[PDB]
N, CA and C of each residue as an Amber inpcrd file, in Angstrom:
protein
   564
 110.3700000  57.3870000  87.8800000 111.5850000  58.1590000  88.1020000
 111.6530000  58.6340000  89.5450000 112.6230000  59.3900000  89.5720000
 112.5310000  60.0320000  91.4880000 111.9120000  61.1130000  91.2370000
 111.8820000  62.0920000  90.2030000 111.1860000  63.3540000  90.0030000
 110.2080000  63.0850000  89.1460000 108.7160000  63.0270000  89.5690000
 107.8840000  63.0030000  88.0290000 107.0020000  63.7440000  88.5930000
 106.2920000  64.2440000  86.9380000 105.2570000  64.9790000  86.8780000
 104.1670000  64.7420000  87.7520000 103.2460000  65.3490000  88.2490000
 102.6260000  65.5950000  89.5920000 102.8600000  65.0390000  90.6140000
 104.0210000  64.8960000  91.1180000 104.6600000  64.7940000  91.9280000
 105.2210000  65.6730000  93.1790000 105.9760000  66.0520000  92.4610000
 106.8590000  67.1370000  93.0820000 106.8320000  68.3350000  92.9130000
 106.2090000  68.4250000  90.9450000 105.8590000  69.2260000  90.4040000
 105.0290000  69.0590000  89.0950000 104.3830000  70.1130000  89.0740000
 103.0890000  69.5300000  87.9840000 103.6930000  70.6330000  86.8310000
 103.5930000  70.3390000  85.5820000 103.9150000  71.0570000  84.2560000
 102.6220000  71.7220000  83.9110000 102.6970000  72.7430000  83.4140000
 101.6070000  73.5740000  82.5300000 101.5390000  72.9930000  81.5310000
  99.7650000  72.7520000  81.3790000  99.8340000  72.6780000  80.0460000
  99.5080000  73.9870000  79.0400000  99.8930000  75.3190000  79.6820000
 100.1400000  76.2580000  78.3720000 100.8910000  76.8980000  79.2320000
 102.2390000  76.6090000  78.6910000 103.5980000  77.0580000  78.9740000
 104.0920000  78.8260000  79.1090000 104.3440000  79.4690000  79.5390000
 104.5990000  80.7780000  79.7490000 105.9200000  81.2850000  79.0960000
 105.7710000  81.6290000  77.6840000 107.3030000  82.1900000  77.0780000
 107.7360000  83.3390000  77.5100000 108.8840000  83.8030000  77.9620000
 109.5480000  84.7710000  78.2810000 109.3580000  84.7420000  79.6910000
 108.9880000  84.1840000  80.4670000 108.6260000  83.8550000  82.0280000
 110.0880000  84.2950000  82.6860000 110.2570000  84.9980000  83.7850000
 110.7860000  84.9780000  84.1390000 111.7500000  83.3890000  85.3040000
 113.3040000  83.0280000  85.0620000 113.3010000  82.0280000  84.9070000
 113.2250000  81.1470000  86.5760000 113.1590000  81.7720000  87.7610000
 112.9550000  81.4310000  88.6710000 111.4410000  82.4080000  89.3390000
 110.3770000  81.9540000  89.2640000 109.4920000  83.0890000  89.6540000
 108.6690000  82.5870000  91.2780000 108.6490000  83.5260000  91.5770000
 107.9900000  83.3190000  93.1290000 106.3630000  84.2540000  93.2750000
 105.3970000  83.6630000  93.6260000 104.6900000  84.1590000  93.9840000
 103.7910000  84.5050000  95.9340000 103.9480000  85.7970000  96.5770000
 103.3620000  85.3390000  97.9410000 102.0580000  86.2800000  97.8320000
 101.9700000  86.2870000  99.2600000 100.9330000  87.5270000  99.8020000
 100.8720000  87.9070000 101.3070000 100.8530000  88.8580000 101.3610000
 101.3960000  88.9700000 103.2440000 100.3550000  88.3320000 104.2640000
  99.2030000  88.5110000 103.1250000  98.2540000  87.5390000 104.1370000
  98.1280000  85.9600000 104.3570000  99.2640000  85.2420000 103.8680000
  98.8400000  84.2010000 103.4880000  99.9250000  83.3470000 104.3750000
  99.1320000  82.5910000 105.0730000  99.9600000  82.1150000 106.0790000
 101.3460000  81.0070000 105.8100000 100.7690000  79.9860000 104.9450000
 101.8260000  78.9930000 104.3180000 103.4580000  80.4810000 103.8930000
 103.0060000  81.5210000 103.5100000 103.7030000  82.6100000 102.6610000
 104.9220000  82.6370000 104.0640000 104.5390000  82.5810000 105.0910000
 104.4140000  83.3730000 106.6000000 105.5750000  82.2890000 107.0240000
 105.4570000  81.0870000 106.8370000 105.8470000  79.9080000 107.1030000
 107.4470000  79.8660000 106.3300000 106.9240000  80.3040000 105.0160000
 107.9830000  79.8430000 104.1310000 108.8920000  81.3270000 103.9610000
 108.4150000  82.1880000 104.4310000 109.4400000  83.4260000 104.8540000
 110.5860000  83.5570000 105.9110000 109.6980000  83.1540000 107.0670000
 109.8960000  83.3190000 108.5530000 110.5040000  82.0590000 108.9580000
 109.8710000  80.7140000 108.7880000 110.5080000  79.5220000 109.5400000
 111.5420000  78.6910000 108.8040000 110.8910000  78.7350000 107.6870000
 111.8370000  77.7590000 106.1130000 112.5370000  78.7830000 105.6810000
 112.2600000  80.1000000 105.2660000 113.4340000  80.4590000 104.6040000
 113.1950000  79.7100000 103.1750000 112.9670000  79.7870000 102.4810000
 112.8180000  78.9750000 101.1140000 113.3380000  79.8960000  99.9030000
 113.0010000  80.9610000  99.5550000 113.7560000  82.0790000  99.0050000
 115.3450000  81.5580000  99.4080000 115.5340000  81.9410000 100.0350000
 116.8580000  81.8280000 100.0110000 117.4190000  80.5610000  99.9810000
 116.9680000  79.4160000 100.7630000 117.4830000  77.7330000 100.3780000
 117.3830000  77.7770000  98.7000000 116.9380000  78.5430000  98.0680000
 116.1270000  77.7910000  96.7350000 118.2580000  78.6010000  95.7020000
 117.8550000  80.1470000  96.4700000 118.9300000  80.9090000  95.9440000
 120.2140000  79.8050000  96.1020000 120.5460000  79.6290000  97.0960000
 121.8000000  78.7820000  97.6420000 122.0420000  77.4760000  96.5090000
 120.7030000  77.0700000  96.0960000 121.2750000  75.5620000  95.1910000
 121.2350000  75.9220000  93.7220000 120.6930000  76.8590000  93.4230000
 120.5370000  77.2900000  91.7140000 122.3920000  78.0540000  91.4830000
 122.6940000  77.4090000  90.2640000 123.7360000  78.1840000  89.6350000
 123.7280000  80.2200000  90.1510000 124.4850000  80.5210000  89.2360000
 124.6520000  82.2290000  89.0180000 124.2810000  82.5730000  88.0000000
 124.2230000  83.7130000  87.9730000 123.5470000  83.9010000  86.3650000
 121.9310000  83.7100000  86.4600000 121.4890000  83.1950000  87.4910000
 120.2560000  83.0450000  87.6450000 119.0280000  83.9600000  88.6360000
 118.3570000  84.4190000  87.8020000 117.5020000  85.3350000  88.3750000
 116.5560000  84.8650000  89.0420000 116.2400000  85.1880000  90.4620000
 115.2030000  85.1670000  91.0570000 114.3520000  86.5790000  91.4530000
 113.0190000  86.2130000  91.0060000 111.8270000  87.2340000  91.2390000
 111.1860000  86.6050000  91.6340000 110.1780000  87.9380000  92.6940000
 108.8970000  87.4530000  93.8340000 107.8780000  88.2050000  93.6400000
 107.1230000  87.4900000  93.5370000 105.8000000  89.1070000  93.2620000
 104.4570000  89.0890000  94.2750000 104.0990000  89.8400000  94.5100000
 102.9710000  90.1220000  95.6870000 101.7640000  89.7010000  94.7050000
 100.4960000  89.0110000  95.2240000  98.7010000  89.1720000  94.8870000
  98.2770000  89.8200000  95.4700000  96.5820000  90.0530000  94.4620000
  96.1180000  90.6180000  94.9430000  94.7910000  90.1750000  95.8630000
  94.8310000  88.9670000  95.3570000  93.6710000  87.8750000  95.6170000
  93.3560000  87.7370000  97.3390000  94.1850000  88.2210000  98.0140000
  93.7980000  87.6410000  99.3710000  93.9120000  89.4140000 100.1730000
  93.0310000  89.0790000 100.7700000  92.4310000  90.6490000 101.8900000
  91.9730000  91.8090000 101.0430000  90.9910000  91.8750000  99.9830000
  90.5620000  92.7590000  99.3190000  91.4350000  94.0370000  99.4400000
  91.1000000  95.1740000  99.4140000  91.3020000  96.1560000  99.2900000
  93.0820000  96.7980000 100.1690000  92.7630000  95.7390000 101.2470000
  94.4980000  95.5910000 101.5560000  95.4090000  95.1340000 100.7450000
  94.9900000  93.8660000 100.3900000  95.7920000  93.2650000  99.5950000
  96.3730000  94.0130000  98.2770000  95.3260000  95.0860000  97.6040000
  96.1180000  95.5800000  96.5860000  97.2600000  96.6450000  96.9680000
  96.8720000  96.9920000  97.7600000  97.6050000  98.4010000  98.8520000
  98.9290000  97.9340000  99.0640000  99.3520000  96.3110000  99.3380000
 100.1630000  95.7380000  99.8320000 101.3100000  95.1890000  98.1090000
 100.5100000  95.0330000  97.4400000 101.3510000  94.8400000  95.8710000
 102.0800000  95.5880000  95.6970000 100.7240000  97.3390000  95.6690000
 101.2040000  98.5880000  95.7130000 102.9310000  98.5740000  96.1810000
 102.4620000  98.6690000  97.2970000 103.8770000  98.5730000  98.6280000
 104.8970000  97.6220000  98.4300000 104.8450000  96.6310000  97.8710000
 105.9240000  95.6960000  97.1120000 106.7130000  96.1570000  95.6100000
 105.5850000  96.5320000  95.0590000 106.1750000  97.5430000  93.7830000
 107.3570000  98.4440000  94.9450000 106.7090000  98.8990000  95.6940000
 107.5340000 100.2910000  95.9540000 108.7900000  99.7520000  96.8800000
 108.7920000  98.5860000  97.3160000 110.1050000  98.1550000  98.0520000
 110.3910000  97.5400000  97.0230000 110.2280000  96.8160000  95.5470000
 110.9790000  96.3280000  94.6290000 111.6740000  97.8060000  94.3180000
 111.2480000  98.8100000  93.4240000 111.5410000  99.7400000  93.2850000
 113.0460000 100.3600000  93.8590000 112.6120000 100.3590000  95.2330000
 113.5950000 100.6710000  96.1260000 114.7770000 100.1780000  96.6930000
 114.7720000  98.7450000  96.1890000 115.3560000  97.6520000  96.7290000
 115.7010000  97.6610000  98.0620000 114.3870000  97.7990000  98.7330000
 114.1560000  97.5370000 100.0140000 113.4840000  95.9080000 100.6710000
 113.4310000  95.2290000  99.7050000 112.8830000  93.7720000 100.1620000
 112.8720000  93.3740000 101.3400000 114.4820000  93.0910000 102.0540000
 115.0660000  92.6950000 102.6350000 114.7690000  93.2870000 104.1280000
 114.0330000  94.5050000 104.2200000 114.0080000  95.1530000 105.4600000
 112.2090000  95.3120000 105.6890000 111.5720000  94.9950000 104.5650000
 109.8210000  95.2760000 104.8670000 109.3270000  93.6680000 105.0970000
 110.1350000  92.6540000 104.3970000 109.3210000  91.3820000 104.0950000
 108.6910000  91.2110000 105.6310000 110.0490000  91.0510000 106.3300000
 109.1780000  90.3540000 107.8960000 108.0690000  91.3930000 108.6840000
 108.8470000  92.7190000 108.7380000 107.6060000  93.3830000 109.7090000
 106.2610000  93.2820000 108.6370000 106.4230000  93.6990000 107.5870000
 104.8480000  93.0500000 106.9970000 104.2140000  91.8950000 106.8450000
 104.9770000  90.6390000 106.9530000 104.2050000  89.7090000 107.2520000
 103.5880000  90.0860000 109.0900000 104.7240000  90.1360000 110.0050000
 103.9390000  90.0320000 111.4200000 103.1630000  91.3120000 111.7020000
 103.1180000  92.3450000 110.8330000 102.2530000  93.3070000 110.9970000
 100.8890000  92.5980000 110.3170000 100.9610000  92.1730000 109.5860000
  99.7440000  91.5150000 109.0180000  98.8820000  90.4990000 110.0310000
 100.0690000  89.6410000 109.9180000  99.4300000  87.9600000 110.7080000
 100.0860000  88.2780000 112.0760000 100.9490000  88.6810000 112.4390000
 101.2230000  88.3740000 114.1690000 100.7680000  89.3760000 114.8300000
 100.6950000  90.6070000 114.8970000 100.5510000  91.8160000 115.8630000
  99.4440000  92.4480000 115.4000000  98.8680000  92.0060000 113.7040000
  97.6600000  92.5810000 113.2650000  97.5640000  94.2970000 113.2840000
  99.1580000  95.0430000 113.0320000  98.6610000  96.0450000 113.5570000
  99.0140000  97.1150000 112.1950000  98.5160000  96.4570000 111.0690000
  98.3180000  96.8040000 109.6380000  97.0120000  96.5640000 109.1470000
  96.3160000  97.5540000 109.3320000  94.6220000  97.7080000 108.7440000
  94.7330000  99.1670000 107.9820000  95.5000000  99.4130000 107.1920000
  95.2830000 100.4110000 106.0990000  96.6380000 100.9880000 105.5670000
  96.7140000 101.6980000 104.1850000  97.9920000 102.0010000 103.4820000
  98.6590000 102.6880000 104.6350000  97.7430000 103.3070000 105.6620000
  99.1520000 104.5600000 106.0780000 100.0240000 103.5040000 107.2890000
  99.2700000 102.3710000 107.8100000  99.8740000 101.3240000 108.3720000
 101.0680000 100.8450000 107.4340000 100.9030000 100.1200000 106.3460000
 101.8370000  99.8480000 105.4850000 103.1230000 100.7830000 105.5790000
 103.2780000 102.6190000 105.1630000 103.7090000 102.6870000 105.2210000
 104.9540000 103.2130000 106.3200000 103.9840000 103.0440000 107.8540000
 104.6070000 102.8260000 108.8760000 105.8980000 102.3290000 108.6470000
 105.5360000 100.9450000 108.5410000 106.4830000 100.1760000 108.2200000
 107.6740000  99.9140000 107.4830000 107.7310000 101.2080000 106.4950000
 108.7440000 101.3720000 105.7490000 109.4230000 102.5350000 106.4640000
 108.7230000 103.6260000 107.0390000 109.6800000 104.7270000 107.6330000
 110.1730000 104.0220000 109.0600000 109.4720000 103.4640000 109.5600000
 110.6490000 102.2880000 110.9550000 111.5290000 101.5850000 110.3030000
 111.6270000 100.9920000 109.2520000 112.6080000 100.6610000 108.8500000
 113.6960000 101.5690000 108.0110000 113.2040000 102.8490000 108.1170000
 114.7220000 103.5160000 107.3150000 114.2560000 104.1540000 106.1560000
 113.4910000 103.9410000 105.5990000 112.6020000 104.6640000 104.1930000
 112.2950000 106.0220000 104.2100000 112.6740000 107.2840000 103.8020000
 112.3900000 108.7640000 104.3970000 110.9260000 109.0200000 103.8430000
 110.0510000 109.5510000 104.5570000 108.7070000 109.4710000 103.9780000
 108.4340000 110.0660000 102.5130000 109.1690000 110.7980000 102.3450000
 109.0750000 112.0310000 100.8910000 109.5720000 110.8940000  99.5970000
 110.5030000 110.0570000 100.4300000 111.1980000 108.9400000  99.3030000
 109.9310000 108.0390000  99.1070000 109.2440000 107.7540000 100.3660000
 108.1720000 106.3090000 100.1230000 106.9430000 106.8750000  99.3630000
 106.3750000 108.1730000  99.2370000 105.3970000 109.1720000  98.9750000
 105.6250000 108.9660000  97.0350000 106.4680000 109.6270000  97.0010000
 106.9540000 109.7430000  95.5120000 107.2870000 108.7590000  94.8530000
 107.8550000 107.2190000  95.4820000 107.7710000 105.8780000  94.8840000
 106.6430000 105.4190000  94.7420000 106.1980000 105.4330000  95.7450000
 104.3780000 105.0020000  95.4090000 103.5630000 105.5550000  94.6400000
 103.6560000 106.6420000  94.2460000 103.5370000 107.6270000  93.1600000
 103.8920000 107.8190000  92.1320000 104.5480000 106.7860000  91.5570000
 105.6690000 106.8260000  90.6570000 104.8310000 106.2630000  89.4740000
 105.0490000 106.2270000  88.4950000 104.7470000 105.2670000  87.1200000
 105.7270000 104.2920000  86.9730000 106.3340000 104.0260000  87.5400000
 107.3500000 103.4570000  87.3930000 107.1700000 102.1990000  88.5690000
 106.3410000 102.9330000  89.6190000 105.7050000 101.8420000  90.5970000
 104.6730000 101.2210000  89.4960000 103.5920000 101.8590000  88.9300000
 102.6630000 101.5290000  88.5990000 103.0250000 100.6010000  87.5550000
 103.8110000 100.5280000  86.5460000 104.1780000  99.5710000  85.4300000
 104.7170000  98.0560000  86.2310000 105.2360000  98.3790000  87.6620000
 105.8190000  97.2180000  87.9470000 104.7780000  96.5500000  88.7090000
 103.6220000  97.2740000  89.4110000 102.4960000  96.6240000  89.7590000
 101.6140000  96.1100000  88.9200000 101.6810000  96.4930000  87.4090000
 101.2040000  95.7140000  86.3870000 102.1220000  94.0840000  85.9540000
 103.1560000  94.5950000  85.8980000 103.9550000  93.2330000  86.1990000
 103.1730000  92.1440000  86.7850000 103.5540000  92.7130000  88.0480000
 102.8430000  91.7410000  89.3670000 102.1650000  90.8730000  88.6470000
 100.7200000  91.6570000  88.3420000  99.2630000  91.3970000  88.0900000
  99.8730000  90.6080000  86.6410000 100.3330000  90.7290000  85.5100000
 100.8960000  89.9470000  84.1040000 101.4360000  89.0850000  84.6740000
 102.1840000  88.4690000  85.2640000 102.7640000  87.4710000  85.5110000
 101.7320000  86.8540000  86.3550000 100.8800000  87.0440000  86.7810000
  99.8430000  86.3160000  87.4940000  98.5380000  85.4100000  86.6290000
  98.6350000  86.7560000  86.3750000  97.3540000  86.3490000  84.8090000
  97.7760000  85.1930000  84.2010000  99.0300000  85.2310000  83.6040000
  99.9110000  84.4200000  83.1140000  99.5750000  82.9000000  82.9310000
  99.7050000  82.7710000  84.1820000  99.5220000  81.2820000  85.1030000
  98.6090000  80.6640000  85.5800000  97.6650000  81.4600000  85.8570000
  96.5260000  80.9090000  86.0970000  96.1700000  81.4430000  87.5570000
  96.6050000  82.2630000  88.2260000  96.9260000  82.0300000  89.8690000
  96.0160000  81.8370000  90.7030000  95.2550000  81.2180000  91.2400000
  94.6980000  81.1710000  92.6700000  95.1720000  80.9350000  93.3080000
  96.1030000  80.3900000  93.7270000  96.9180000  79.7460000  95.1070000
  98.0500000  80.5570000  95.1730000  98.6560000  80.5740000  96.6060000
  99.8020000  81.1100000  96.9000000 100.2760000  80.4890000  98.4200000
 101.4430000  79.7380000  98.2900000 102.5820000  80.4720000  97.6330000
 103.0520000  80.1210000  96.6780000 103.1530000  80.0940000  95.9510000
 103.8420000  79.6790000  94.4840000 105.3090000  79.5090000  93.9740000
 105.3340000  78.5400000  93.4150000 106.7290000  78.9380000  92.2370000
 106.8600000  78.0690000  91.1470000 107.3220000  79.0310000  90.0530000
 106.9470000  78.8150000  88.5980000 108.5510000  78.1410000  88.1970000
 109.0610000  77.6120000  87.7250000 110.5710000  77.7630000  86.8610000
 110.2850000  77.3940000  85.4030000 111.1080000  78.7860000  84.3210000
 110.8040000  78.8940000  83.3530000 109.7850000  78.7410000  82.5720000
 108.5360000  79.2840000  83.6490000 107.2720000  79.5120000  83.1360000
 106.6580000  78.2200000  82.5050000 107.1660000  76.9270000  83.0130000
 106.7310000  75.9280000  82.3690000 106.6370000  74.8060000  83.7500000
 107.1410000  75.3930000  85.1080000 106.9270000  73.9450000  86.0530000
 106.6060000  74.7850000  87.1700000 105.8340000  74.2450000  87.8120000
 105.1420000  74.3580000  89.2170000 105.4320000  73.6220000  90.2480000
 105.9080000  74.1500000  91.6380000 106.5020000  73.4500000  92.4810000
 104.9380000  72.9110000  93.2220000 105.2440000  71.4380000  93.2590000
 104.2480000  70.7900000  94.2110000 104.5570000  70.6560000  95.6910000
 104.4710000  71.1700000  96.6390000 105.4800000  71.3240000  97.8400000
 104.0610000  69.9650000  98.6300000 102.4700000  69.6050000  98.3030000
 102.1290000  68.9750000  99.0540000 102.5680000  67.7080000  98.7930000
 103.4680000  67.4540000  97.6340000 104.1280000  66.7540000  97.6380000
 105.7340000  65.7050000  98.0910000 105.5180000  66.3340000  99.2960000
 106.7960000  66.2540000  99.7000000 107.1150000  66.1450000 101.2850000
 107.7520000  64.7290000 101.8570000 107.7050000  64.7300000 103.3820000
 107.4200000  66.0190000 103.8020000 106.6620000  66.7640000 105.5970000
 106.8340000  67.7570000 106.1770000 107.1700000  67.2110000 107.4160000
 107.5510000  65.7310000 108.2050000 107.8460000  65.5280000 109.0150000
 108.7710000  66.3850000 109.9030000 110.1670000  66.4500000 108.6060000
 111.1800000  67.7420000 109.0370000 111.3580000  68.6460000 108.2140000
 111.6150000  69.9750000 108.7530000 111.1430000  71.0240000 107.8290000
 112.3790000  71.2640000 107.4020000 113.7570000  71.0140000 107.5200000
 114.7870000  71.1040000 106.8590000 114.4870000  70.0030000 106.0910000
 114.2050000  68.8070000 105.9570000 114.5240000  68.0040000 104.4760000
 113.2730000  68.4790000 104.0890000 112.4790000  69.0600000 104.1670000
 111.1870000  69.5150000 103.3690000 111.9010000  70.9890000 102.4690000
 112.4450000  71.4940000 102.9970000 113.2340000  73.2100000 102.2610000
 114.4410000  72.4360000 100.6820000 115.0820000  71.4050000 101.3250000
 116.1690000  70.9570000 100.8470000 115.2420000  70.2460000  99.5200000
 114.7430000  68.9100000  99.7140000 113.9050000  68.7200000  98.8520000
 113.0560000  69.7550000  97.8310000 112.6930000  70.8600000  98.8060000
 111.9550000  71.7880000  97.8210000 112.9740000  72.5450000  97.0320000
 114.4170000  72.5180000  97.2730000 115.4640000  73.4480000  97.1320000
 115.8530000  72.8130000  95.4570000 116.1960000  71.1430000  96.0830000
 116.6030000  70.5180000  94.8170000 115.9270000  70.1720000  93.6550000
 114.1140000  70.1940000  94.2670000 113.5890000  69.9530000  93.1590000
 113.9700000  71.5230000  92.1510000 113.9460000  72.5600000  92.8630000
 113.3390000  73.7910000  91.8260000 114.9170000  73.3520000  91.0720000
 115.8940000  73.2360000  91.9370000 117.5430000  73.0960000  90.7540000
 117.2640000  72.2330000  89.7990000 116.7270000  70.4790000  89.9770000
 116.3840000  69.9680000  88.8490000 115.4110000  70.7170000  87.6630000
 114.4930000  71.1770000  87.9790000 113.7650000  71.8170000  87.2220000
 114.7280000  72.7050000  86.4130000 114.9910000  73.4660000  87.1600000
 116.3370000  74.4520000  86.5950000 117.2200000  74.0380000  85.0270000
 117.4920000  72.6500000  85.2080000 118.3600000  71.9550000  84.5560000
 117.7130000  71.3190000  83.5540000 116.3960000  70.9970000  83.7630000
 115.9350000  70.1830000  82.7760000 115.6140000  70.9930000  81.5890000
């Protein structure tokens, strides 16, 4: 076929019911993550070709930079929470990987009061149970799947995007390709 199994994308063989139906997995430390934020844009190519009605979720690990790394879930709970995504993703990736100038939570939440976050608001979200149930999320939907690798993406908890599968000569037909496979998936 043009799309087959380990290909493009490899199928679980123990399928994830109730999965959320477009799922993304990164980590701020993780450079491919860095790539597909910052240069590809893939989140959003992926948004652009899927119908409406269709949910996309991203969830932070904890697997990469010990004790940062959970600090940093933490801090994703609390910009999911907040629906602040859109304004922490990049300075925390290049605070991480480009400028390196994130080595502990109160770094992290630098980064949310430069961007607009009032500290008493970021204090009490992070504090929240309401953070904490969604940082269990995180971690359940991880478990889930099996996760070691990142960056990830799941559709309907039953297909896995194979991205080393796929020209990188050019990184626009590499996004597009990765765009259409997740829509076929979508459909099937």
């Amino acid at each position: 076929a043009q799309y087959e199994d380990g290909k493009q994308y490899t199928t679980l063989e123990k399928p994830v019911a109730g999965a959320p139906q477009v799922l993304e997995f990164f980590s701020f430390f993780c450079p491919h993550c860095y790539q597909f934020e910052e240069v590809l844009h893939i989140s959003d190519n992926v948004k652009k070709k899927l119908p409406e009605g269709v949910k996309m979720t991203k969830y932070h690990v904890n697997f990469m930079g010990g004790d940062l790394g959970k600090d940093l879930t933490q801090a994703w709970a609390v910009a999911m929470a907040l629906g602040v995504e859109d304004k922490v993703t990049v300075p925390l990736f290049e605070g991480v990987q480009k400028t390196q100038t994130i080595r502990s939570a109160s770094d992290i939440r630098d980064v949310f009061i430069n961007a607009g976050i009032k500290g008493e608001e970021y204090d009490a979200a992070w504090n929240s149970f309401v953070v904490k149930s969604l940082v269990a999320q995180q971690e359940k939907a991880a478990a889930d799947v099996q996760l070691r690798g990142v960056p990830a993406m799941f559709v309907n908890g039953k297909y896995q995007l194979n991205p080393q599968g796929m020209d990188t000569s050019n990184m626009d037909v590499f996004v597009q390709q990765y765009a259409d496979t997740v829509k076929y998936l979508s459909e099937k």
